[PDB]
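RECORD TYPE: protein structure
NAME: DNA cross-link repair 1A protein
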Amino acid sequence: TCPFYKKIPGTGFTVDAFQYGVVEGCTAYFLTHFHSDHYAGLSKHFTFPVYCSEITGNLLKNKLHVQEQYIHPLPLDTECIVNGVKVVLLDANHCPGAVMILFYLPNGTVILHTGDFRADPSMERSLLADQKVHMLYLDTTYCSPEYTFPSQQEVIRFAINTAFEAVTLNPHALVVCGTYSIGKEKVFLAIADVLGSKVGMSQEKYKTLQCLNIPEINSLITTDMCSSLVHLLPMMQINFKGLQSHLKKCGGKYNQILAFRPTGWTHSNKFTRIADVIPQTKGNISIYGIPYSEHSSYLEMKRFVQWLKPQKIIPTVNVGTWKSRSTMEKYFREWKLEAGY
Ligand SMILES: COc1ccc2c3c(cccc13)C(=O)N(O)C2=O
Ligand SMILES: COc1ccc2c3c(cccc13)C(=O)N(O)C2=O
Ligand code: NI
Ligand SMILES: [Zn+2]
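PREDICTED:
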């Protein structure tokens, strides 16, 4: 049962629809980015063409072992023709390799699928400025006004300052950052840079980062944990028990852990500004939850949609309940009446 919001009308295209078997009529499967809820179903035994960014294609080949004959990477900001239809991939400001897709239908309809994105004013000067867009398939993850969080710049500044202070006060403190999906790499890269260290991680995480075309990555990451003052761990280990366990394995090199858990929005945001964020502490371990989002805030999403002025909006997130659907449609109507389209 492939949902309608993953189908592109007038085409043989689906978007992020790999867990529904052979979709009837689908001649090309697009993947917006390498996140689990979006590539779900893709495996080494997929035998249909997959269209994606170069970075996403690297991850499909090396992490999911999809055969190269079915991986069709496309450059960004470049008009391409897929099965007789003009398409453009645009940077989504989400995770590495994440794209939005512009479809130019033969009948003149223009469709923008945002994939997952964090709307930014720089998108208002992309190839979208040249385009009337009739249908918008919109990442509505945080489509409610209570969803406020700081800029990525502000969050990284807090993380850098917090880590530099803690390690300058105690040179025997270890910094740990939690990760699961790709994305939010700036958190641990910026901290390692201010500490003059490479980032140590597992072989599997190292493999993943090697696929991301990050400039000078070999100067920034390592599998030699002993040489690193900043360690990556699975997000599930970012707790007092998991961190105590990791500290023991470091052989008495460290006597303190400062850990960061990059989250999306938490209602702590509704009460606390980034400068007033405090950690959870138990003994010699402190855990900071930092609101580093790679999705649009409500205000960022509203600004983007009011600039784009689409004729029709199709939400791709929070579609499962009538309450969420009615809430989002109320906001779309508000935005349209305020802006005048
Ligand atoms: C369990 O934590 C996640 C699982 C899946 C995803 C995800 C994302 C952000 C942040 C967290 C997650 C995301 O952007 N996407 O697409 C995902 O699939
Ligand atoms: C199972 O838990 C998730 C599955 C998918 C997603 C997700 C996210 C946050 C937090 C959790 C999840 C998210 O932001 N996005 O985009 C997702 O697709
Ligand atoms: Ni995502
Ligand atoms: Zn997602």
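COMMENT: Residues 237 and 245 are 9 Å apart (CA to CA).
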